[PDB]
Amino acid sequence: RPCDCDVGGALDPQCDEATGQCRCRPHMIGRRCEQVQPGYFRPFLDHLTWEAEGAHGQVLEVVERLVTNRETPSWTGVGFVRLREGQEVEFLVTSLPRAMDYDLLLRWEPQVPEQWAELELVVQRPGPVSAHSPCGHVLPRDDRIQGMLHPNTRVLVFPRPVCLEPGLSYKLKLKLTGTGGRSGILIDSLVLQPHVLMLEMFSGGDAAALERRTTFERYRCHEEGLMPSKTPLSEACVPLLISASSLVYNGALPCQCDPQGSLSSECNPHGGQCRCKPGVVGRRCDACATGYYGFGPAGCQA
Ligand SMILES: [Ca+2]
Ligand SMILES: [Cl-]
Structure with missing residues (x-):
């Protein structure tokens, strides 16, 4: 009943x-x-993942990585960007689903043993927050967050979330102020996880x-x-x-499976992965695998 x-x-x-x-x-x-x-x-x-290697701003070295028969890559996109002290990465964030808190996850990989790093994240808005919005409580201190990368990790959850809104474009700037150990750090991506x-x-x-x-x-x-x-x-x-x-x-x-790169318009209802043709990758089967070329009806070839 x-x-x-x-x-x-x-x-x-x-x-x-x-x-x-x-x-x-x-x-x-x-x-x-x-x-x-x-x-x-x-x-x-x-x-909601933004690749470091798709970022705008100062020229940075892209470090590509190949998938092995092992499957289960530990990165997304072509690979990583190498970031050195004093340099900055700009993520252009748009089309968020809802006005709420997002936790910021920085995915990374170290280059020396026992490596640590100090970082600063700054949120740049396209205007002042409104009193009638769910993010109307935000002040300048809420939009600059320090973070520390610790040994033996591949992801950092920043210690405070950020409140962001739909229909707006933001620039999230990530600056590396220091790194050491006992060539910088590799950054994979930034993830905005709804809280x-x-x-x-x-x-x-x-x-x-x-x-x-x-x-x-x-x-x-x-x-x-x-x-x-x-x-x-x-x-x-x-x-x-x-x-x-x-x-x-x-x-x-x-x-939204790619018409050429996918076997079907129907994707996995948990997570949304489309079924890719040979040589094709991405949730939407909309890119060649790294080292492959010739995106089209057959897929990609090495
Ligand atoms: Ca990446
Ligand atoms: Cl997607």
């Missing part, structure tokens, strides 16, 4: 008529709006919210976002990420 619509996938908490159908956000389906529509996907917590625990499905006061919050933290579901590799999560994480993603993105996103 009970409605029990999806807290994330449906608009109202109760069903209509005697069909038991809920009102769904865009491209969520099922009687309770609990399923992603074929042709659409729920994004991974690290969907989904602030959503009411978790942060609310009701018993149902407290349970979701407890489960999310116990199984550390937020770790999906840390690295390119995706190791299977506890099954308990799955419906929580489906619901949280629907609330961030307003339902599910269209796959």
Whole structure:
């Protein structure tokens, strides 16, 4: 009997008529709006990734890396950028899904043993934050954040999140002020991970919210976002990420598989990977693998 619509996938908490159908956000389906529509996907917590090697600004050395039969690369894009003391990388960030806090993850790889580094991140906005926006509380101190890279890691979560808004273009500047050990550092990318625990499905006061919050933290579901590799999560994480993603993105996103590079318009509904032709890479199968050429109907060749 009970409605029990999806807290994330449906608009109202109760069903209509005697069909038991809920009102769904865009491209969520099922009687309770609990399923992603074929042709659409729920994004991974690290969907919003900007490659260091795609960055504008001062000329920096690109360090390419080849995929080996080992599979499971530890980087994305062609590889990395080598950043030395005093140099800066500019990430041009646009098209964010929602006005909320994002945690900043810097993915990197050291060049000497026991390597540490000191960094400064500055958020540059296209105007003053408005009093009526969810980011209206932001002040200048909130938009400059220091971070330290520690030995034996490949990702840093900066110690404070940033509040960013949809429909706007930002420039996030990353400066390396010092690095040593006992040729600089390699930077892979910057990831903007939505801080989904602030959503009411978790942060609310009701018993149902407290349970979701407890489960999310116990199984550390937020770790999906840390690295390119995706190791299977506890099954308990799955419906929580489906619901949280629907609330961030307003339902599910269209796959947008590249017509030439993909075998199909239909991508994986968890994370959105398209099925690539030989020699093709990228979520949308829209680039040649490194060392391959000739993007077209057949794929790419070495
Ligand atoms: Ca990269
Ligand atoms: Cl993408």
